[PDB]
Amino acid sequence: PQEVSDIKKFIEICRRKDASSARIKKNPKTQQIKFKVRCQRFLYTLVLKDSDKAEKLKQSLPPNLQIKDVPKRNKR
Amino acid sequence: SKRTKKVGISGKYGTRYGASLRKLVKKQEVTQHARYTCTFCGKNSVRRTAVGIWSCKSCKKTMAGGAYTVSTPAAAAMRSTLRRLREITEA
Amino acid sequence: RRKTKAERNRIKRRKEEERKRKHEEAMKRKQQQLEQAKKIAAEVEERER
Amino acid sequence: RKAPAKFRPLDYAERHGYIRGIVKEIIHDPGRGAPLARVVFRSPYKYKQITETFIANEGMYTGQFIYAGKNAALTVGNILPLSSVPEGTVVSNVEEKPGDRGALGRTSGNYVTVVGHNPDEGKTRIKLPSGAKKVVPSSSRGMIGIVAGGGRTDKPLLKASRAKHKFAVKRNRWPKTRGVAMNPVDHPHGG
Amino acid sequence: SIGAKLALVIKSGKVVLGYRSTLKALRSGKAKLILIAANTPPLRKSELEYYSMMSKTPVHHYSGTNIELGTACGKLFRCSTMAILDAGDSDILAD
Amino acid sequence: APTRVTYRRRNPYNTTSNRTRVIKTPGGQLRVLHIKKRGTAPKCGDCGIKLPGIPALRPREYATISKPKKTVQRAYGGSRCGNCVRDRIIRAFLIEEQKIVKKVLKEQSQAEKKASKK
Amino acid sequence: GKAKKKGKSGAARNYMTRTQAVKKLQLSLPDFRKLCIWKGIYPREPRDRRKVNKSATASTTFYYTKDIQYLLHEPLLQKFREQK
RNA sequence: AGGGAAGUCGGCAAAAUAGAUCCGUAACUUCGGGAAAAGGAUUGGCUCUAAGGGUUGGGCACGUGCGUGCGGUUAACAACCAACUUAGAACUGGUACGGACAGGGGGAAUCUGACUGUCUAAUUAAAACAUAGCAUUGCG
RNA sequence: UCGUGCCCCGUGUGGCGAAAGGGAAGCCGGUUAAUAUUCCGGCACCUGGAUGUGGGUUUUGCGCGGCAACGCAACUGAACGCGGAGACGACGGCGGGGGCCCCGGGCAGAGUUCUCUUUUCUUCUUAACGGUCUAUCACCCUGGAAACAGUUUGUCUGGAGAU
RNA sequence: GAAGCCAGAGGAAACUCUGGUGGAGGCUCGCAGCGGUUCUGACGUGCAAAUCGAUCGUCAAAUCUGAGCAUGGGGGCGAAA
């Protein structure tokens, strides 16, 4: 697992061809949001403060990338 | 503070092996555990590594010497007569 | 001159202070990039094209 | 033990001139009371260096240049043929015949004294550590000096453990039970 | 003789004791004499002789060790080499 | 709470290849973790000191890291230390200078001998 | 399973030099060149010639290993030996 | 119970001693030991007292949280934090206080083997064997 | 190309022999009646191969910076050599780190409650693999120390350059 | 409580004394382990073709121990019974 501290680098990673899927994790106790993209070798995580612009980053993310919100319970 | 009257380093043997043998081993133990001045760097850091091997901790030089002393009187007399024989041969 | 324990503690405190300032400034630049994320996406699009 | 303590093979350089080697290590050899010396020489016929193992004479040190050959100087650690040394010098690892890389005066504190020369037939009279007198070819080689580690037997062993530790690496039999302590079936002295 | 001259130089003139200060004096070019002990390492001795050859400085090879060179200087520490910058009242330079 | 552990492999003997350390899992359990031996720092070929700037790894771990991590940007870098390199440079220069000096003196002696013979 | 060794697969197996081809076919150089011309064995170029041979230069000629294998079964080799 | 080896070939067996603190400890000796020699005083509980530590923190003149130029060694002071030993005293229960457990009987000598060690698995563990030291012989 | 040869090199000789020696690489959670570092999910790593993209280097052709110790994502390297790692005893005390043990506060649960006990007990966890900031030794630069200094529980270090 | 080291007190000095430090020894009490001294011991067609109990020796080493390997009866091995 790798952490990305640059929005531009995260945008290029999400536009890589091997980016199979993406998910959004919300931590309201910490008041943060996490964008996790699943590539071939590494899972890349971008950590942001919970904000409207952090929500609008979805619009800058590519459309063909299947993005989903993490549920409260990881049901097996 | 002197703790033993005469046994010295041989006090580790207690009452064993005989007074004469303890006195015989004491001098070899003292001269083999003493520190010596190096003839290359001048520091007092030459100690015995193995049998006839004397290493300096400072300049890292290893010399071949006697079993329990750095230099043997026979070896020193040998060096003296070798020097005079070499002088005679060259002259 | 030989320094004092108070001076050593002051030097140390400046060291964690500058580390904290670097961390805060990195958070600020990440927030600014998040604010200007759409232009960044457009520039990435232009470079790929 | 890694390598036997032998001289270099007698070649053109030692037969007609000299060759310089450098002492890299002075090491302990298990089972032997005398330290060994690792000396690196140059190969005259190829690029690769050659490492030899000599019996270290007293006074040798790491980083020292020794010289082996007919024209080598009369200095401790130098290996010379016995025809190139004067009378009264002491040498070590003396070859019985030229080319056997050393046979005489090898243990610690021991040496061989060059008593005399007979250049008419190229012979050298030598005195062994046992007091025996021997005649060797004058082209036999010896290292100038006395073998290091003398005075080893002046210290009492003082303990069966120290005798055991001495003889366990030297493979000699220890402990030794007496023949008179045996049965008559085991020893002629049995009973 | 040499010990008495060195002691009077110690009393009157200026010296620097040690390898780095001797090299600094040789680089400055104000060194009037260099003394090198017998048990100096041969590489250091050759480098000191090369520095003195470039700076046109005389070299005296002290027959004693570094301990005896320090004792002849009157100090309680060893000294492998030294540089005399001012002879003072001695005639150690005229030799 | 169970605080006692077991080996996770079939070797039951405390050999040098059987080093373990205690970890606590996210499941709340105490467990062992088999670990490799410690890497050894590469050392200078002349003096034997530890070479600074070079990682201490097991021998086949050095194949997975790049060239600048395994070396120091100097002559004999990653094989000899800086003091030994300095000593080598000074010794080489001084010995070559003395070789030139000895050749000059030998030529002068040969010329003097030729003049004496002639 | 067992770890592979370097240089035992890929371009090293795919190509060989002219010297290796001649030594494999046990021919002289004129016979090898004659057979290559007659059978249409053409020179090739690896992407990295060091992966085939560490002593290769820009003038080193490379051939296909399968082409040399095909040349091993040519009946003209026995004709050459019979003529010799 | 009383006596205390009167038992028995023979103190066999059992009993007695035992931890810790303090006082003190002979001959002999290879000067290292003997030695925990011998012989003595004490030990519970409770309520206190005393001693033994760590971290942080000094005034001016300028440039501006740091850089100098000074000035001072009573910080010998304050604030906060911290754990286990040792010593002393009073009070108090008692037939017991190392209250169970745990845990040397000691001494005067003689013979004997120097010591540590080893053996007759399945009747003998020893003055037996080995040991270091010493002496002799053979071998270039 | 006298086309059917020539040159270079020396080091020898193969195999077996260790589920405790050496050795490339996997962790966590869940799952069965019975297997699990093997299955399932997530997240990794090693070895070997082929060939792309980005970035790097280059018109001063094979990088730049730092006095130095050296650093940085790269930053040519055959034969033939040198070196390091693999690769190493026993014992003694000292220091750092993990885990365990112990103490206090808090939320939740459980027990005790004639009387007392703001009480006693239980859960409160964070793997491999990575990033980043630091950690004894040692090394480098300045400078030149007796009124000797630094320093460990343990007396070693220093004009061969200490504080 | 051996060398080595520190401090104080004397000695012209070498050394002497005192208080510490230090942690040596085929040293010592003793747990596990290894061994096997004693007991009118248990057991004696036994739990056992040598076991059980108490007591004992030793316990940092000439200590204990696994696997692999070597030595084979005219033999081996044997701190020797």
Ligand SMILES: [Zn+2]
């Ligand atoms: Zn030295």
Ligand SMILES: [Zn+2]
């Ligand atoms: Zn080096």
